[PDB]
């Protein structure tokens, strides 16, 4: 009965840029999801394919915890069936997702005077990501008929852009930390259970 190490995910001092989202595998442990659900710190707590009322009564083969920073008005893209720059090019949930999405405002940690440089997102991609796909490449995006030949400029775009979070931004443009919990059930022994 070791307790699941969710603190390492939720309380990490730095989070990943969404294009380079992080994942931690959680297994062989007991989780009290009510602590997360009841925390006043989280302004989003939305589950799909499972009801919150059941989280402490179920066992799963593995839980994955993916985490990253996006801007507030993009949190809505972290849900099945959604679209936009984040869902299309950065982090994509599947239609049949079973899991929960948890988010909170991180303006106090993730903005900087003069604009934070640390948090980037992919702005251009030739096709949409498949669910749970990850793209950390930085090839020049060729927007037109002229080959870019490894040089950024007209019609030749570097594909990642900084959010530039500044503490004075409006709330929709402020950083939010996001943790996505996936509940995986395989034909294998369950290892992560509620209490």
């Amino acid at each position, epitope marked *: 009965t070791n307790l699941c190490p969710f603190g390492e995910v939720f309380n990490a001092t730095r989070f990943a840029s969404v294009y380079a989202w992080n994942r931690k595998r959680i297994s062989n442990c007991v989780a009290d999801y009510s602590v997360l659900y009841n925390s006043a710190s989280f302004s989003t707590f939305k589950c799909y394919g499972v009801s919150p009322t059941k989280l402490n009564d179920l066992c799963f083969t593995n839980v994955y915890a993916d985490s990253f920073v996006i801007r507030g008005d993009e949190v809505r893209q972290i849900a099945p069936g959604q679209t936009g720059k984040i869902a299309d090019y950065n982090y994509k949930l599947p239609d049949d997702f079973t899991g929960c999405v948890i988010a909170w405002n991180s303006n106090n940690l993730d903005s900087k005077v*003069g604009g934070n440089y640390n948090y980037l997102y992919r702005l251009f991609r030739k096709s949409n990501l498949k669910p749970f796909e990850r793209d950390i490449s930085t090839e020049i995006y060729q927007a037109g008929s002229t080959p870019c030949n490894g040089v950024e400029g007209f019609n030749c775009y570097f594909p990642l852009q900084s959010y530039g979070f500044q503490p004075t931004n409006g709330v929709g443009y402020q950083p939010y930390r996001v943790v996505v919990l996936s509940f995986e059930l395989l034909h294998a022994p369950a290892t992560v259970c509620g209490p």
Partner: nanobody
Framework: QVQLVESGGGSVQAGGSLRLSCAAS????????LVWYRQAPGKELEFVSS??????NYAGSVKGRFTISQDNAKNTVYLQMNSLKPEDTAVYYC???????????????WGQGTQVTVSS
């Protein structure tokens, strides 16, 4: 336990040169890629150059003047900056995606920045 440490910034006269270094240390595994960016305060972070598995790219404004290279024997990438111009003044940052021992996931790390100031 991976860290990126920059070195090499400073003040130079227009036309001069500097060489920046971005050195990875700790429980490093494979580097998937590495990007040099620059930002002056309040301005949007700007792409400068990147390198991945030997392929390189550059901002149009620095192509021909700056060269990115991977050290043939060290966990370090250099940015050689020649023919410097006042417009090159900024804090330069490296960012890399690197897996750590025990993992196949390349995770993002950032250097601490180095000021470059070019005066006319």
């Amino acid at each position: 336990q991976v860290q990126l440490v920059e070195s090499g910034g400073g003040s130079v006269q227009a036309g001069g040169s500097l060489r920046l270094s971005c050195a990875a240390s700790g429980d490093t595994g494979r580097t998937c890629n590495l990007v040099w960016y620059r930002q002056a305060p309040g301005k949007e972070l700007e792409f400068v150059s990147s390198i991945s598995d030997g392929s390189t790219n550059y901002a149009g404004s620095v192509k021909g003047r700056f060269t990115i290279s991977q050290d043939n024997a060290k966990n370090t990438v250099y940015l050689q900056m020649n023919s410097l111009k006042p417009e090159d003044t900024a804090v330069y940052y490296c960012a890399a995606t690197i897996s750590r021992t025990g993992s196949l996931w390349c995770e993002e790390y950032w250097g601490q920045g180095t000021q470059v100031t070019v005066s006319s």
